[PDB]
Design an enzyme around this catalytic site. Structure first.
Site, mmCIF file in Angstrom:
data_model
loop_
_atom_site.group_PDB
_atom_site.id
_atom_site.type_symbol
_atom_site.label_atom_id
_atom_site.label_comp_id
_atom_site.label_asym_id
_atom_site.label_seq_id
_atom_site.Cartn_x
_atom_site.Cartn_y
_atom_site.Cartn_z
ATOM 1 N N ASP A 160 -51.787 5.849 -6.660
ATOM 2 C CA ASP A 160 -50.442 6.675 -7.294
ATOM 3 C C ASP A 160 -50.154 7.495 -6.020
ATOM 4 O O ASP A 160 -50.753 8.198 -5.238
ATOM 5 C CB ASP A 160 -51.117 7.692 -8.296
ATOM 6 C CG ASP A 160 -49.921 8.555 -8.842
ATOM 7 O OD1 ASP A 160 -48.884 8.182 -8.899
ATOM 8 O OD2 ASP A 160 -50.339 9.597 -9.442
ATOM 9 N N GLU A 269 -44.350 0.169 -8.398
ATOM 10 C CA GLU A 269 -43.507 1.542 -9.053
ATOM 11 C C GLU A 269 -42.875 2.160 -8.011
ATOM 12 O O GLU A 269 -43.456 2.541 -6.923
ATOM 13 C CB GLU A 269 -44.533 2.325 -9.724
ATOM 14 C CG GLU A 269 -43.835 3.623 -10.336
ATOM 15 C CD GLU A 269 -44.603 4.371 -11.251
ATOM 16 O OE1 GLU A 269 -45.122 5.313 -10.940
ATOM 17 O OE2 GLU A 269 -44.592 4.077 -12.374
#
Ligand SMILES: [Zn+2]
Length: 490
Positions: A160, A269
């Protein structure tokens, strides 16, 4: 070894907790998970390569093994469902970040029987630095969680908020299946705020080949994105190019250098949610159109939505305007095939039904700190003396943590600890400001030490959470369950 012999003998006598869904078998070796004296273990029995490869202490024909990284790699080899997998972009996913390493089972219990895939291993570089953990431990906790719960449907692992190439390489080397590229540092925020002749001036310093490419594709053109018309005039196009071009180039560079070349499926992402300016739907269209034109394979896009998505609390802003922009954002995602990603998604109850409706259930939502706040809530309920010490420390050091997370917390709204009874301490974790106070100070609290170097709170914190393991998992089921229910899952 006398410790191991005691546990093994009590297990034989039926005096040790066995996790009932943890029984698995590989060739002639049986393995299960137990808990003894506040610690979990693997127990292996039966001759076989699985028995031989696990590291542990042997008594009878039984091997007692710690939940170590090396034993996780052994489980990965014999039980593929314990290995993270990518999911592609045509389903629902929830990011279930765990700052502590103890929320995995409760997270699995929550998604069991629901039409959503869990990203069970998800931590940011900052979260690792503030907790003193590494990515191996994050995947370890997720792999052992699905083994404990016998959850074979598959889980994901998200690197992330990655920014540096070294960290992207590390994530890929360690088996992460989702890679989140933070592009906030490449965004030109001053170009987003500048006056409109200055936009035209900075725009004119670009090479003509660049200005020709964008003008030939967008200038004075209208794109039909379902029922939404997206039009670019010169002023909007020039600002969009100035704000986003360098970030777009960075997206393409990373995709071609690291994602395309990964040799396995990776969900990519693109994150621009930590920007000072909100992502206009028209800017979103331009970014996506440029990436898709360059053959970039996108799993999800995380824009910065109108309003504010702060940690620990519900949405700030005008929900009617949020809905109008979400409608276009969702249509753009549908046009190009990737999903919308909602960062700082936990506790945003006011937006969840809208997100589920406009994405037709095809979204990514990320959580992390809310799972830490549920652990804090258990401490408030069961160890009030520890809660008071942690809350007071957070108050004393709050300014250090606001440097890392942007919040508008009003400490003046928080009742003084001397004014609240032990029975009332859990009510703090229902309040905006106290929630933010504890949410953002996790690293300062976890790493706090006494003058002799021992932990100030961390050891006792994990001791109470182990003693209250069933309470914590019931809290996660209820709290994350409410997120899934309002999102419309299943
Ligand atoms: Zn984010």
């Amino acid at each position: 070894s006398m410790k191991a012999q005691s546990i093994i003998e009590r297990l034989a006598a039926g005096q040790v907790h066995v996790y009932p869904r943890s029984r698995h078998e590989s060739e002639g070796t049986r393995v299960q998970m137990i808990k003894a004296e506040g610690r979990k273990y693997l127990v292996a029995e039966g001759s076989g390569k699985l028995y031989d490869e696990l590291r542990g202490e042997e008594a009878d024909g039984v091997k007692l093994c710690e939940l170590s990284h090396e034993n996780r790699l052994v489980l990965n080899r014999h039980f593929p469902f314990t290995v993270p997998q990518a999911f592609g972009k045509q389903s629902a996913t929830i990011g279930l970040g765990d700052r502590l390493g103890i929320a995995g089972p409760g997270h699995v219990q929550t998604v069991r029987g629901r039409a959503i895939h869990p990203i069970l291993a998800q931590q940011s570089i900052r979260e690792l630095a503030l907790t003193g953990r590494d990515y191996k431990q994050v995947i370890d906790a997720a792999a052992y969680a699905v083994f404990q719960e016998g959850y074979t449907e598959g889980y994901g692992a998200d690197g992330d908020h990655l920014k540096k190439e070294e960290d992207i390489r590390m994530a890929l080397d360690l088996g992460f299946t989702m890679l989140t590229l933070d592009c906030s540092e490449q965004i030109d925020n001053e170009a987003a705020q500048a006056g409109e002749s200055e936009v035209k001036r900075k725009y004119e310093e670009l090479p003509e080949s660049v200005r020709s490419h964008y003008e030939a594709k967008y200038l004075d053109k209208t794109f039909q994105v379902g029922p939404h018309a997206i039009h670019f005039d010169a002023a909007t196009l020039m600002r969009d190019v100035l704000v986003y071009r360098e970030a777009i180039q960075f997206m393409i560079y990373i995709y071609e250098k690291y994602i395309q070349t990964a040799g396995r499926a990776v969900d990519f992402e693109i994150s621009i949610d930590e920007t000072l300016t909100p992502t206009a739907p028209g800017s979103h269209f331009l970014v996506a159109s440029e990436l898709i034109g360059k053959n970039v394979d996108i799993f999800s896009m995380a824009p910065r939505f109108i309003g504010e998505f702060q940690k620990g609390i519900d949405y700030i802003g005008d929900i009617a305007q949020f809905e109008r922009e979400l409608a276009v954002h969702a249509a753009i995602a549908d046009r190009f095939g990737y999903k919308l990603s909602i960062h700082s998604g936990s506790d945003k109850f006011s937006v969840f039904a809208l997100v589920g409706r406009y994405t037709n259930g095809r979204f990514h939502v990320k959580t992390a700190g809310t799972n830490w706040l549920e652990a804090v809530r258990i401490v408030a309920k069961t160890n009030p003396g520890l809660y008071r010490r942690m809350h007071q420390y957070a108050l004393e050091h709050f300014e250090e943590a606001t440097a890392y997370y942007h919040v508008t917390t009003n400490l003046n709204n928080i009742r003084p600890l001397a004014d609240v009874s032990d029975e009332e301490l859990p009510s703090y974790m229902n309040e905006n400001d106290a929630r933010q106070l504890l949410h953002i100070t996790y690293g300062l609290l976890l790493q706090a030490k006494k003058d002799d170097g021992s932990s100030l709170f961390r050891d006792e914190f994990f001791r109470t959470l182990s003693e209250r393991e069933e309470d914590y998992e019931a809290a996660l089921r209820s709290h994350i369950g409410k997120h899934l229910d309002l999102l419309g899952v299943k």
